Amino acid sequence: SDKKDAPPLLPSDTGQGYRTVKAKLGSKKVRPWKWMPFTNPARKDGAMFFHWRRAAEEGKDYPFARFNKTVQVPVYSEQEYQLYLHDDAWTKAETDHLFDLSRRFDLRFVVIHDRYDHQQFKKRSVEDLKERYYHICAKLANVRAFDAGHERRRKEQLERLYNRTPEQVAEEEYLLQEL
Amino acid sequence: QERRWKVAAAKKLVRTVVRHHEEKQLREERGKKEEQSRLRRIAASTAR
Amino acid sequence: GLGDVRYRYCLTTLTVPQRCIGFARRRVGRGGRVLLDRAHSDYDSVFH
Amino acid sequence: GDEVGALVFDIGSYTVRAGYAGEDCPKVDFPTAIGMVVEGPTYYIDTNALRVPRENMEAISPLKNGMVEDWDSFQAILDHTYKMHVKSEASLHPVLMSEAPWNTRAKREKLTELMFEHYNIPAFFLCKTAVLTAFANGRSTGLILDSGATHTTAIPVHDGYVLQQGIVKSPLAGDFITMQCRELFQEMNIELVPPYMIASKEAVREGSPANWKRKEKLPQVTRSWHNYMCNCVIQDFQASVLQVSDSTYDEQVAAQMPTVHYEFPNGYNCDFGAERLKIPEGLFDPSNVKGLSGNTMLGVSHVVTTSVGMCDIDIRPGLYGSVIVAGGNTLIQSFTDRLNRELSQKTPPSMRLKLIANNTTVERRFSSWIGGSILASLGTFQQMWISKQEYEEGGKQCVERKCP
Amino acid sequence: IAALVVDNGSGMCKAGFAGDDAPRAVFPSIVGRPRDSYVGDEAQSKRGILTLKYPIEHGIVTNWDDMEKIWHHTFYNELRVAPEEHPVLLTEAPLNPKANREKMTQIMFETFNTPAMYVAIQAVLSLYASGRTTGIVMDSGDGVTHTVPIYEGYALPHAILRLDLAGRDLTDYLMKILTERGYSFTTTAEREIVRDIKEKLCYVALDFEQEMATAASSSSLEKSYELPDGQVITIGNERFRCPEALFQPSFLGMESCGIHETTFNSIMKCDVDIRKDLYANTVLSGGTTMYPGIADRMQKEITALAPSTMKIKIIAPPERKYSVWIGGSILASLSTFQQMWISKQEYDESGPSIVHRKCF
Numbered sequence A: 001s002d003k004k005d006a007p008p009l010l011p012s013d014t015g016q017g018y019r020t021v022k023a024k025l026g027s028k029k030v031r032p033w034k035w036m037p038f039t040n041p042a043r044k045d046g047a048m049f050f051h052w053r054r055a056a057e058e059g060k061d062y063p064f065a066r067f068n069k070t071v072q073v074p075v076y077s078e079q080e081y082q083l084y085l086h087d088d089a090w091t092k093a094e095t096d097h098l099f100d101l102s103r104r105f106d107l108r109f110v111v112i113h114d115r116y117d118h119q120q121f122k123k124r125s126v127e128d129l130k131e132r133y134y135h136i137c138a139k140l141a142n143v144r145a146f147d148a149g150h151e152r153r154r155k156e157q158l159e160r161l162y163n164r165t166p167e168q169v170a171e172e173e174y175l176l177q178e179l
Numbered sequence B: 001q002e003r004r005w006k007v008a009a010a011k012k013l014v015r016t017v018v019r020h021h022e023e024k025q026l027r028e029e030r031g032k033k034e035e036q037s038r039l040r041r042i043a044a045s046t047a048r
Numbered sequence C: 001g002l003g004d005v006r007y008r009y010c011l012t013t014l015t016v017p018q019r020c021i022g023f024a025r026r027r028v029g030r031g032g033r034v035l036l037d038r039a040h041s042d043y044d045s046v047f048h
Numbered sequence D: 001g002d003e004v005g006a007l008v009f010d011i012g013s014y015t016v017r018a019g020y021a022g023e024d025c026p027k028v029d030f031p032t033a034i035g036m037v038v039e040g041p042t043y044y045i046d047t048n049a050l051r052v053p054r055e056n057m058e059a060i061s062p063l064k065n066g067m068v069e070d071w072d073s074f075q076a077i078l079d080h081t082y083k084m085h086v087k088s089e090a091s092l093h094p095v096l097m098s099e100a101p102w103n104t105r106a107k108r109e110k111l112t113e114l115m116f117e118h119y120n121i122p123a124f125f126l127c128k129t130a131v132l133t134a135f136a137n138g139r140s141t142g143l144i145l146d147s148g149a150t151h152t153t154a155i156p157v158h159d160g161y162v163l164q165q166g167i168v169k170s171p172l173a174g175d176f177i178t179m180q181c182r183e184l185f186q187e188m189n190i191e192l193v194p195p196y197m198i199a200s201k202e203a204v205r206e207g208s209p210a211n212w213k214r215k216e217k218l219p220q221v222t223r224s225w226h227n228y229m230c231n232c233v234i235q236d237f238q239a240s241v242l243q244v245s246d247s248t249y250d251e252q253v254a255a256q257m258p259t260v261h262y263e264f265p266n267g268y269n270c271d272f273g274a275e276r277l278k279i280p281e282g283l284f285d286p287s288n289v290k291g292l293s294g295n296t297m298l299g300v301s302h303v304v305t306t307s308v309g310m311c312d313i314d315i316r317p318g319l320y321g322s323v324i325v326a327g328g329n330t331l332i333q334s335f336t337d338r339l340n341r342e343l344s345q346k347t348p349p350s351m352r353l354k355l356i357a358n359n360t361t362v363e364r365r366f367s368s369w370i371g372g373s374i375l376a377s378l379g380t381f382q383q384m385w386i387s388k389q390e391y392e393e394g395g396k397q398c399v400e401r402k403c404p
Numbered sequence E: 001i002a003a004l005v006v007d008n009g010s011g012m013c014k015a016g017f018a019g020d021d022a023p024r025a026v027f028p029s030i031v032g033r034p035r036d037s038y039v040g041d042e043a044q045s046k047r048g049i050l051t052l053k054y055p056i057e058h059g060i061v062t063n064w065d066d067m068e069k070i071w072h073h074t075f076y077n078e079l080r081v082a083p084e085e086h087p088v089l090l091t092e093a094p095l096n097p098k099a100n101r102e103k104m105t106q107i108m109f110e111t112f113n114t115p116a117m118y119v120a121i122q123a124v125l126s127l128y129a130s131g132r133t134t135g136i137v138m139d140s141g142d143g144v145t146h147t148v149p150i151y152e153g154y155a156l157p158h159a160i161l162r163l164d165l166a167g168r169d170l171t172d173y174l175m176k177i178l179t180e181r182g183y184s185f186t187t188t189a190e191r192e193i194v195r196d197i198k199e200k201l202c203y204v205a206l207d208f209e210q211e212m213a214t215a216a217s218s219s220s221l222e223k224s225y226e227l228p229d230g231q232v233i234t235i236g237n238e239r240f241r242c243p244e245a246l247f248q249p250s251f252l253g254m255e256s257c258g259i260h261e262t263t264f265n266s267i268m269k270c271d272v273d274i275r276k277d278l279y280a281n282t283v284l285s286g287g288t289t290m291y292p293g294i295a296d297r298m299q300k301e302i303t304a305l306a307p308s309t310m311k312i313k314i315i316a317p318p319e320r321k322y323s324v325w326i327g328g329s330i331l332a333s334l335s336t337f338q339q340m341w342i343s344k345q346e347y348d349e350s351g352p353s354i355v356h357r358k359c360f
C-alpha cells in the first residue's frame, strides 16, 4: 500500500488553465458511454449485470473471462475407483468429498485441510491429503497413458525450533554462529 | 492511494482557498492604508 | 535488504514539471489512468 | 472498467455500514440499535430517530456479536437503509453482506432466504468480516484482530480463505472496557446525567457536583432506552479518556504520568490518573479485574498467540509478516504499539514479524466494509455473485457451493 | 471565457461565472409539463396552462429529463453562454449516490458537450466561502438540511447527518399555523405568498417558553403584511413558532431531532481529537439557515449541549444563503484547482466513473 508518504500523482489535462487546451478539446467530442447489460461467458449460468461501456462495444464480451481458467479434477463413479483408482483406507465417499473440496479451494492444500470435514470423516493431516492427491493423479495418468515424509519432518523441525523456550533460543543461536 | 491523493488534494485546495481569503483581506487593508497615505501625500504636496 | 519484489520505487524525472521527484513507481488505477506513487525518502532534501 | 451497481453492507456489533462499491468510505454509519413501540416493530431507526426521548419507547439490537438475533428487525433496518440512506429501491443493485466467520451456516442460509425472497435483489454474495478486513489491506497472508463492543476475536486468512476452525473468541472487548468504566463510575460515584434532559450549564470547577435542570416536557422512557443512551455516553468516555501503557502496568509510572480531564454532560468534570492506564491492562491481563478475571479470560497477546499456533507452519510464517488490528477496541490510545510489544514478547522474534499500519477511525471500523467495496468492483469477482435465477436453487445449495 | 458555476439547489438554482462575487442568475428550479416545457422563470408565470414538477427533492436529483431541461434553461436562457466553450462546476448534495454523480457527468459531457467539468460537495464549497481549514457545516438548504463535518477540507461521509425538514416543509408548517390564525392559504400562489411572509416576518426566538409568555402578555409581536389581493393581515406569535420547529421538529409533527441536537450528533460521530476544532468552526449555510437570531439560538443551544470547556463559535456570514455558490466561484478561480477539471479526453477514455477518480 504505502508507508505514509507523499500523495499519488495523477494524470491531468487542465494543468495550466483550459486556455491552452481550449482548442484541443473544442475540436473533438466524446464517444457516447452507456449503462449496458452484459453476461460474462465465464458464468456457467447466464446471468446479466450492468456496467458502464462505450455504446460501441455494447454486449461485445467480458475481457475478464480469460481469467476463468480452472484446474482439472479426476472422475470416477462406479468401477474406475475399483479397477484403476484403487483404495484400501479411503471410501469412495471420502475421496469424492476431498476432491470436490479441492476444487472448491482450487488445490490450495492448507485451507483444503482446514475445511476437510473432521466429523463426517476421520482426522488426518495436510500432507496425507497432498500425497493422496498425488497418488490419484498418478493413477489417472497411468489409466489414461518431493517426499511427504520429509515434509512432516519439516513441520516438526520448525515446531521444535520455534517452540524453543526464549533463553534456549538465544543460547543455541549463539552456539549456532560461533562454530 | 486514491484516499491519500484525495486527502492531500482536499488539504491543498482548502488551504489555497484560506490563502485566497487571507490575501484578499490583507489586500483590502492595504488598499485602505494606501488610500489614506495617498491623500496624506497629496496634502503634503499642496502644503509644500 | 530483504529483497521485496513489489516495492520497486525508483528515482524518476518528469518532463513538464521537470525535476527529480525521488522514489516513484507507476501504476494503473481505475479507468486506465497511469499514476505515479511516491516515497517521502530521507533523501528528500538532497534533490535541490 | 470493473464496476457494477454493487452495494456493500457490513453489519458488525455496533454500527451498520452501507455504501456503494468503489466508494472510498461507507456512505452511512448508523448504530446497530433500533427503537420499538407497541403495535409489530413500530419503529425508529438511526441516530436521529433513536435519540429523541419518547413515551415509553424501548431499544433493542437485532444483532449480537454479528449473528442476527431478529430477522424482522434486521429486515426493517435494511428497509430504512435502502429507503433513505441509499434511497434506491433494492430491486436492481447487487449486494454483498459481511458475516462474522463464526456466524452459523444456517443463519447464512436464512439471511439469503430473507434477502432474495423478500427484498428481491437481483444478485448476492457473502464474505466474512475478517476476510474483508484483510481484503482492505491487499494482503493474502494476514492475521486479523477484530474487536467491537460485544466481542473481540482473532482470525487468520490465507489465500483469501479463513482458516475456519482457527477462530479465537474473547469477550474482552469494547463492552468489557465499558463495564470496567461503569464500575469505575460507581466506585467514585459518577451520577450519569443523560444529555437528553439537561437544559442548563451551571458548570462547576474540578470535582464539584455541577448544577443543572431537567426539561419539564420530558416523557417517561423505558429503562432499555436510557441504558442505551448512557451506554453511548460511556462509549464516548471510552474513546476520550482511556489510554494504554506501553509496557506492563505499574502504579508509580501510572501516577507519575500527567492526568487528563473529562467533563460530563451535566457540567460535572473530573481528572483521571492511573485508572485510565490500569483499565486496558484488564484487557491485556484479565486477572487484575473484578469478577471478570478468571483464568478462562484470554487477553489480546494470548489470543493472537493461540490463533497463530492452531494453524500449521505452512502459513504461520505468512501470519508473522503481517499482523492486522481492526475494530473498535484497537482505537484505545496506544493500544496498537502495546499489542506489538506484547506479541514481540509472546511470539518468538526469531523469525520475520511485522505489523501492518492502520490507525484512523475510518480505517479500523470500515476496513471490514472497505474490503467489501474492493471485492464488489473487482473485475474477476463479477462472475461470483449469486443471481436470482441461480438463487432459485442457490439460496439452498449454492449459497454454500459458491461462498466459502 | 470563464468557468460556469451552476449550483443545483432543492428548489432554487443558482448560476454564474467563476470569479464573480454573487450568482448572477437565480431562478427557481421549477419545470412544468403543459396540461413545450418551461422552467421556473417562465414556468412560474405559466401555471394556468402548466403543471409544475420539481427535479430535485431533498437535494438528490429526482429524474434526469427534468434536470436536463433545468440545465438547458440555465445555460441557454439565463447565462446565454455556450456550454461547449466554458468549464462547468456542478454541486450536488452530500451523500449523493454514485449512479447520480455518474449520470451528471454523462449528461454534461454528452448532451451539453462541455470541455471540462467538476462536481463538488455543496457543504465543502460553503466552507470555502467561510474560509476555514476545518469545520462543521450546517446547511439547511431548499429541501433538506445537512450537517457536514469537514477536516482539512475533506468531508467525513460517515458523520454526515440528514434531517428531512427544511425551508419547504417549514413553509408548509407556516401554512398550517396561518390557517390556525384564521386565514387561508392553499393555492400555489397563496403558498408563495406565505413564502414571502416567511421571508419578511419570522425569526428564531432565543427562548421558546419565554416568547410564548411574551406573546400572551404583549401584542407587540404583531406586524402587518400586505397581500397581492389587496387586503392586509397581521402576523405575531407565528413569527417564531414556525422557526421554533427547526429545533423541535415535533412542531412540524416530524419525529426526528432538532437542528442543534442533530449538530451535536454529527459532532459526536466525528473523531474525538478534531471535535474541538469542529466546535470552534461551525458554519451556517443554506437558504433557510439565515433566519434572524438563528445563529444566537444555535450558539446558546450547543453551548449548553457541548462540553463547557470547548469554545463553540457560530459562523454565519450575512450572505450565507449563496455561500455554496461563492465557494464554487472561489474554487473555480483558483489556479491550483485548474488541474482538477475533468477534460473531454478523460471522460472519453474513462467514462462517467471518472467523476469518482478525481472529483470528490
Ligand SMILES: Nc1ncnc2c1ncn2[C@@H]1O[C@H](COP(=O)(O)OP(=O)(O)OP(=O)(O)O)[C@@H](O)[C@H]1O
Residues within 6 Å of the ligand: D011, D012, D013, D014, D015, D065, D066, D100, D129, D146, D147, D148, D149, D150, D151, D152, D174, D175, D235, D236, D238, D239, D240, D327, D328, D329, D330, D331, D332, D333, D364, D365, D366, D368
Ligand atoms: N475511540 C475509540 N476507541 C476504542 N473503541 C471505541 C472508540 N470509540 C468508540 N469505540 C467503541 O468501539 C467499538 C467500535 O467498533 P465496532 O463495534 O463498530 O466494530 P465492528 O467493525 O462492527 O466489528 P465487530 O464485529 O468486532 O463488532 C464500539 O464499541 C464503539 O463503542
